Amino acid sequence: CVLLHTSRKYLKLKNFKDGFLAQASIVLNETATSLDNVLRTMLRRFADLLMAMLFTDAGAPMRGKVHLLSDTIQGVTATVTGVRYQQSWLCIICTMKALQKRHVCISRLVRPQNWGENSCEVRFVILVLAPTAMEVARTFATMFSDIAFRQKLLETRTEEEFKEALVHQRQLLTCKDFVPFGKGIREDIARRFPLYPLDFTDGIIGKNKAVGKYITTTLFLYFACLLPTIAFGSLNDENTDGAIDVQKTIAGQSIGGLLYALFSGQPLVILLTTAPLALYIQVIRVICDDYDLDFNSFYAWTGLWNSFFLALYAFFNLSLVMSLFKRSTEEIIALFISITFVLDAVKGTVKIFWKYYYGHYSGQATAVLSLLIMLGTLWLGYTLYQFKKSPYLHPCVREILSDCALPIAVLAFSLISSHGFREIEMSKFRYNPFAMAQIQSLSLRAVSGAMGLGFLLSMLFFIEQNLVAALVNAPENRLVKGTAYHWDLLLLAIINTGLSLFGLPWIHAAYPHSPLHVRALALVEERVENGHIYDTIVNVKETRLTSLGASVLVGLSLLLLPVPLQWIPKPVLYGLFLYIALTSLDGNQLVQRVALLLKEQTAYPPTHYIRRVPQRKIHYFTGLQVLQLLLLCAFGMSSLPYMKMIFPLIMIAMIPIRYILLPRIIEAKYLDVMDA
Amino acid sequence: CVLLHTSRKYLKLKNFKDGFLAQASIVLNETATSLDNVLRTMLRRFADLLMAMLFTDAGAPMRGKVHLLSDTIQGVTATVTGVRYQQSWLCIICTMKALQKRHVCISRLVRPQNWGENSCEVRFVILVLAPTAMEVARTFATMFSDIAFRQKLLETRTEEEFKEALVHQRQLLTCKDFVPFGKGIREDIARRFPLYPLDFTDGIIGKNKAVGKYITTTLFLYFACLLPTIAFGSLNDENTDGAIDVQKTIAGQSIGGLLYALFSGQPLVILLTTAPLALYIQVIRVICDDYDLDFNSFYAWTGLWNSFFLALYAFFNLSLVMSLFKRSTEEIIALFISITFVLDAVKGTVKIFWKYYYGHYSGQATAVLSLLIMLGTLWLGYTLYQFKKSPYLHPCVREILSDCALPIAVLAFSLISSHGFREIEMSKFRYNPFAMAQIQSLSLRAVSGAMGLGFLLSMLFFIEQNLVAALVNAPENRLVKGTAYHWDLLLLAIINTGLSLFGLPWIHAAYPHSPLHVRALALVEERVENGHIYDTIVNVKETRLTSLGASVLVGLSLLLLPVPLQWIPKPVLYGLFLYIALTSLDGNQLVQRVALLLKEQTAYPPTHYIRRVPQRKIHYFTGLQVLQLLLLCAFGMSSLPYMKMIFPLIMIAMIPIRYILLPRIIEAKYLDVMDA
């Protein structure tokens, strides 16, 4: 072995408040795969024994030794996760006494190449030869450290355009809030009305064409909204004894998505039915059965009261308090939703076994095949989804696999269970081939009960919709257009009134699908941390065409319901539920901290928040979060409808708990470190 | 973000051909988890505002910035895989003008910690403060760069012992080969006879006690030899129409393992039946059925001829030519073995479906449950095995998971399929509760045929045994005791004669279990490359107690045949075959190159052999290897016994092909880079 001396030092960003800009040599579309070839081409561009000195193996270039660059500059940032390097660019420096004049070469690679440990996705290489080099390297790093400038340089097609862009960039670098009634809605409408034509024509016309990306994301959204829509329709049919069918769920989802895409601010939010909504509909069905009330009328009245409360919240600008919402409560809610998905799948398979395996109406074969198909669908979907994080696959391959993991698994296992195992008939969701509910035919006592239930549902809707909207409107997503929280809530209430009046299932912003929609509609910079791909969004196109097309396709899918879309057996839908439950915990810090018990704290990155905070306080915070999650499960997953209807109240209550009690029992600094 | 300047430079290993050795301060068993605490303790040991200067965030220690060490020295090596850093230690340097005298502090951490990207397993931190620092840091790095010296320092218990060890280490650092008949056997016997008592007492007595490690590895070996032994016994019973039972396979494996452990050199090699051996036994059964020859007599004669040829090879010292063996041929053979395992599992499940699902004697339920159990066993075993590579799990946790993955999966799914699904009876391996074969009652023509078949089997045995022995005797394993190839081959021939005379299935060195046995019986230094744990063996204990105990336990397991060990259904054994097939390709470079078509070449480390070699030549080599593998599969996996009996010949032929033809069509430099 050979000893290596690594020296790290800061460099102040150049303060612009040039000759080498024009004298720089630009290489575009470099197809070389190795560092040696790229550097040889870059050096030849100047006009060789000069490439050898660039690395540590200076003096013994023939013998096989460690081949590492000597002087490099990169962008670095500090975060709770650790030290994140800017791996999209690299600046190599070489001070050669033989040379007489400074030389600068900027090379843009066709594909991101792995130039080092923290430079796994380098696309720009800035080689600076000097006869100092420090000043030129610093100024070029300062110019290249901008996230948008790198994308602008990527968009350039010619060397002259590259130099002009560089010159242009250098020159350029040189309480009581709720008192106003309806202020938030008016502000959101004013913000998002002028930008509306652009939403339709962002990528259709202009310098950048997004037709292919728009089509691909439209297909993604259509599939990822239809398949969960079918699963939720089947679940509701099982829960409501056929009151809400799969056809009703599909129609409601299509209408709601179309209305939201057409007439909402922040169109990137996707409306879909959720597991807690199914649980609450089950609560309504149980109450109606107990009190002999018509399901349709009671459901319509509950939806009407929920929409009324949501409109009251929107008009009074309550959404602002959602700024106090922290990540811990969000992750607790997400884990509860995943647990509800898992329990729905388990209940479905248990019912299948009870009806078929135990003969409580060849049933054993059907039950075993159902279990096998559900587990296999889950496994295949999870594997195809996790292939997205592989840093060695082509970007196209690992974005198609992410895009078409669940659809591929569903199709493959539907074929397996309907053609490979056609001799074993199994369960399929009901389909009997939209009348307004008789709201007037209901007692006043039932109206008051619906009022209370709608209040609880409105709290649930407020929390969920604002959570997903905040996720979509995160600062790291780089959304130029303004936010629309109150107008979005009002439109959600309106469309929910419309859906409830016709008995269609309720819908709100979908947590798993909205960030996925944003990512599919965004340009990202690949980052490799611990051997996994992480995406840094640079530009989101922010168009309504994708959501509108997805909604229209989902609506048109009603014609494929009888003959197609029914060969998908119920166990495939349960596997879809399981896949959603597992894949909704990708960035869950609560799950990470829970697993930390089985992991090694010292194993985490030196500057990781886990290693920074004492393990005792981390465990205390995890225990408090787990206690909150257990209490949420206890109320919101019991057999008692009267106590299953209360879980929105405790969802509201956790926010005051996190805001008040936890800082009193846990130090504020540690909570700030963990949450951020 | 803040620009970072990384400077890399060589440092010549100190040439010893001291005061600071004695003046150094030693800290032992440091339980601190963060770098700040560890260094604060080290600085306090001298006797604070000095810890801040050690990192790049000098001048702004309060504001949250990137917290990286400034000057660090570590051990680095170059390999075809890439640049491998010595992560087991770090040297931190600080030149402070305030200080008046040099200071050195050596801290040993209780557990390995992550101190950076390439310092993921740091156990020794050497901090050098200077008022130069370069000389002291270089000499300490040179002393610590030794792999065995780090283990010796770990073994020390007191500061005085640590200093004495440091001082002692510093002082210390200051053709025609086959003509002799039987020379190899005599040399091996002379080499490995004096060391024989030590083999029994390596860890039992002395400074280091290995009782716990010996017990754990004995349990691992017992389970990993019994379960595949049962699977192979069932496969042979299916193939040979009950001629070779599971009881016979267990007895033969136990006797052979005991004999090999007792009276062989290099006892770390594990003898077990293999898939090609099962295929060849099937060939023998088919030939006997075709020619109406007694299976036992023909099998015994074939084994006798195979042993005679193996003894001839051992006495004439042919094993030496195995040095010409390359990694490409080894990996082709391993992939062929895995494919044979997969086809055996597929044939078993196809037969189960044909008998039960199609009723060609509730069968559909049994077939579907068989498929589900096999797939689930494969999945669980693979997951528990792959958890071994997680860099965040505790070393004990991942070591146990690797040790008890297959046994845990087998037990869990046997319980599931025998208790959870007890209503669905399914296939179980035959067991009817050891007579010498009537060799004298066989025709001369059958004797000549058995001679030819035994010649082919002897070539197969030579290749397989020498391959596994070379894997066990790899230089990187650090085996102090000498190698024994010819004596091992002679003993293998003797025990094979003994086994064949009684009709027991043949056995030779097991490729998947011998390296695993070595690893379980070895101390390793953890390395994290691309987020995966890689082990560097420092010391292998090299004892026969583990293999002897495993063989004795396997033999004693015959008493657990009737009531235990039969609830394991055949699909569990097929899942075991699949698990072995998938887990035998961990380091397979042929599989890596085949998958490279779907991967990105530029995403590999800069110094990886994949990027160094042009992709065209990599693809040509992969295509040639795949063609050889396809020919091997075609000959050794067809329905014709006369052509299924020839695959050992082409296994032999592939070595001349690799040695002669490939260098002619592929450049020698690229082949050397890829193979090494």
Author numbering:
A (entry chain A), B (entry chain B): 105 to 121, 131 to 160, 173 to 256, 264 to 306, 336 to 522, 569 to 640, 645 to 887
Relevant lines from the article:
BTR1 (SLC4A11) is a NH3 stimulated H+ (OH-) transporter belonging to the SLC4 family. BTR1 shares a similar membrane topology with other SLC4 family members, with its substrate binding sites located in the central cavity between the gate and core domains. The TMD contains a core domain (comprising TMs 1–4 and 8–11) and a gate domain (comprising TMs 5–7 and 12–14), resembling the arrangement of UraA25.
Given that the binding of PIP2 is pH sensitive and histidine is less positively charged than arginine under physiological pH conditions, we presume that the pathogenesis of R125H mutation can be attributed to the charge alteration of the L site which in turn adversely affects the binding of PIP2, ultimately leading to the impaired transport activity of BTR1. To further explore how PIP2 participates in the complete substrate transport process of BTR1 and prove the connection between PIP2 and pH sensing, we attempted to solve the structures of BTR1 with the R125H mutation or wild-type BTR1 prepared under acidic pH, which may both disrupt the interaction between BTR1 and PIP2, and succeed in achieving resolutions of 2.96 Å and 2.94 Å, respectively. Compared with the structures of BTR1 in the outward-facing state, the distinct features of the non-PIP2 binding BTR1 structures involve that the NTD has undergone a significant twist, as well as an apparent conformational change has taken place in the TMD. The structural alignment of the TMDs of BTR1OF/APO state and BTR1IF/R125H state by the gate domains shows that, during the conformation transition process from the outward-facing state to the inward-facing state, the gate domains remain relatively unchanged (RMSD = 1.678 Å), but an obvious displacement has occurred in the core domains (RMSD = 3.784 Å). The core domain of BTR1OF/APO state needs to go through a 12.38° rotation and a 7.4 Å shift towards the gate domain to reach the position of core domain of BTR1IF/R125H state. In comparison with the alteration of the TMD caused by the disruption of the interaction between PIP2 and BTR1 during the state transition process, the conformation of the NTD changes even more significantly.
